[PDB]
Symmetry: C3
Subunit: 294 residues, 3 copies
């Protein structure tokens, strides 16, 4: 009966809508929900450090009344079985937030822990970032369903997979614009196409950056790590092809002049700074929502 | 009032230990009902060698007492390197209401405690692990009731921190403690004599034997621990062959009382000191035991702060 | 506008007095001010770790009702994977203040130029202005009014404590003397800024290699370690030049009979200061160490309400 959140499609379309609505309420009233008052603990474990993931989660948990126990990459599983660690953590904390690499490690922890496990960021998915992206799109553009989103650059990385899955879950027509060596994992693509039939969305994968941008409502990129990606740069030429009032997203950090140009990132279509803040609100909502169902 | 420290299990008298364990039971039922550190007031939690389960239990426990744990890993300069230990203790005493320290040699804890003007707690050391044994006693009481007169046997390395603390903390609770260990691996003589003298006051006893089967027979509680600490991996000994007859396995457990329970200071190395069947079977109390580090350490801190 | 505290003369004499008054009030009532209730966040960022800096700030923020997010060395150093400007914009969305221990002053200036929350220099190569606030609180509680006191600092005259004692000291009206050997003198820009500020407060600046003249008639004697970790490979013999400037019993006996002794910890007993001086009746190093908690909480309270 314990819900986990390891990939974007772990939420149904109706569940994802609940979490995003909660994120909006929490942005307006950040200390109104105190499910962890006590404080109750939440584990925030990094197999590899991520300062942005730490600020977001550590502050968010505290604003829910809890105390985050942050374990930096100075690992889980060397000492004892992941199953034994999961059993003990379940006695100390009400949720486990974990940044690890392979998906099989997250699945293993989730199969044994008796508290919710959240994928903070992994090799294959970045589902919390995409919740923050969807919150940012909704507050700038309103209804998500039927919007057109294009992601540019490395189509094999965790953002491309999560934009496909979380995007179609929200009714967004998602396009990935990527060069040949760097396309979405085929099982993720197939999961996105199936979910997309439930929401009226669709999946497109192309090497044509110009067609990806033409008519886009949301344009997204991410760092590249490098010649194959240059045609996919978000520059101002690409952005003129989009629909009026298009918004640009980029989970930070950005390498200005590589995947994105100053003019795009500092211009009026950029929503990168609101996007960064909304990681706090979206992750708090996810936690609140998981905790009440577990 | 004198400042009370908790560096070894016998730092509590039998009556004082009973007060702490009763408070641990109350705190398990009502975990935010005691707020002596409301403010927050600080508590230092220092690791000369990192321990992640010591971290979760103390960091959360201190927060639930209303306090704020300042957690210092060994990534900082080891205490005693950049400035004297006495200088550090004097400064710490201006910032925090208690000092929790995982360190190696017991003389370092003694030194800190002699100069600090706030309680010092041994979170785990080479010679003792008294906080773990408080959690063990809480767990035993939960399962069996009165501790006085129970029979507890520990198996494996008889000179490690858990053997020493089970001796001292166990006899302080009135438990008849047996250590089953091979020759060359027997309890420190000073700790054994201290346990024998304390056991006189409680009606307990101390037994040390190389006969694992005899130690298991009639026991109410069977305990083991890893055979080798990190610092012993390079000591030159074969640290498998001497201990294999002391494995806590189904055969050994079946020799004990039908109602016996099994304890183990985590992490366990399954297949070495304990088997999967025992670890995962119905006699195992290891998960409740791990949880009770939280409650027993909170009780200890509440009790020390009130007396200091 | 947003106020920052990057060096000691970022506070005017009147503003410094307000922060020091607040520090005394917070020492008496340490949880009575809750500007960060929520909790609101405060970033505490270390380009190079300092355990003493971390404890003081982490507890202080919590006692203001906030939650400190501590970033130790081990994260990618600010500037490596992203512009300081971009990091500052994102930080400003998460926290109500940025406390940063870094190296060159230009990095602090850059952060403060674009951050929309107060930026505090926790400790840097050029200045240690939070420690000097704690020193001034310590002197005030031991001596009363600061104006007109005579303070002499001994040792490396170009380190961050020498620079902040000059600037923070003259801001408080203290006559500051730096006693240091040739080649280890205060930065000229810092000395000139102190000399300008001293005209406003009736204070004065003296730089001298004459250790006995600097101790004579002093109300406060201060020293610091002769070498920072980043100076250990600079090629200099960093012991012989400084031995004449040791804060020892003979040097203390030249000062005013009611003189006090300060040293931001840790001390290397036997080098810059002796056991007899560290542990005798003139030493105020333990109160000084504690007051870093109260002075830093005061600064945060004051910056948060002005910004
Ligand atoms: C939410 O993330 C942050 O606030 C953040 C990002 C990058 C940084 O280098 C630092 I320090 C903080
Ligand atoms: C109470 O102890 C724990 O919850 C714990 C133990 C071991 C670990 O490796 C980790 I991550 C957490
Ligand atoms: C405020 O500074 C301290 O309290 C402190 C200083 C040095 C240390 O090694 C440790 I642990 C704490």
């Amino acid at each position: 009966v314990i819900r986990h959140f390891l990939r974007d499609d772990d939420l149904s379309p109706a569940e994802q809508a609940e979490v995003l609505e909660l994120a909006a309420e929490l942005k307006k009233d950040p200390v109104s929900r105190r499910p962890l008052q006590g404080p109750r603990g939440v584990a925030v474990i990094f197999d590899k450090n991520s300062t942005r993931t730490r600020f977001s989660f550590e502050l968010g948990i505290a604003q829910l009344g809890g105390h985050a126990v942050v374990v930096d990459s100075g690992q889980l599983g060397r000492d004892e079985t992941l199953q034994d660690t999961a059993k003990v953590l379940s006695r100390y904390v009400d949720a486990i937030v974990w940044r690890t690499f392979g998906q099989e490690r997250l699945d293993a922890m989730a199969s044994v822990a008796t508290v919710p496990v959240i994928n903070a960021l992994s090799d294959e998915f970045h589902p919390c970032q995409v919740l923050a992206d969807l919150q940012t799109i909704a507050e700038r553009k309103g209804a998500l369903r039927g919007l057109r989103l294009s992601y540019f650059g490395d189509g094999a990385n965790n953002m491309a997979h999560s934009l496909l899955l979380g995007g179609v879950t929200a009714g967004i027509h998602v396009t990935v614009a990527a060069p040949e060596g760097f396309l979405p994992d085929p099982s993720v693509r197939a999961a996105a196409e199936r979910r997309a039939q439930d929401t009226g969305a669709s999946v497109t994968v192309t090497a044509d950056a110009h067609a990806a941008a033409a008519g886009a409502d949301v344009l997204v990129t991410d760092t590249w790590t490098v010649k194959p990606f240059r045609p996919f740069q978000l520059n101002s030429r690409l952005l003129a092809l989009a629909d009026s009032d298009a918004i640009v997203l980029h989970c930070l950090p950005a390498h200005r002049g590589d995947e994105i140009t100053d003019a795009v990132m500092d211009g009026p279509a950029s929503a990168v700074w609101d996007e960064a803040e909304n990681r706090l609100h979206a992750q708090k909502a996810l936690l609140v929502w998981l905790l009440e169902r577990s």
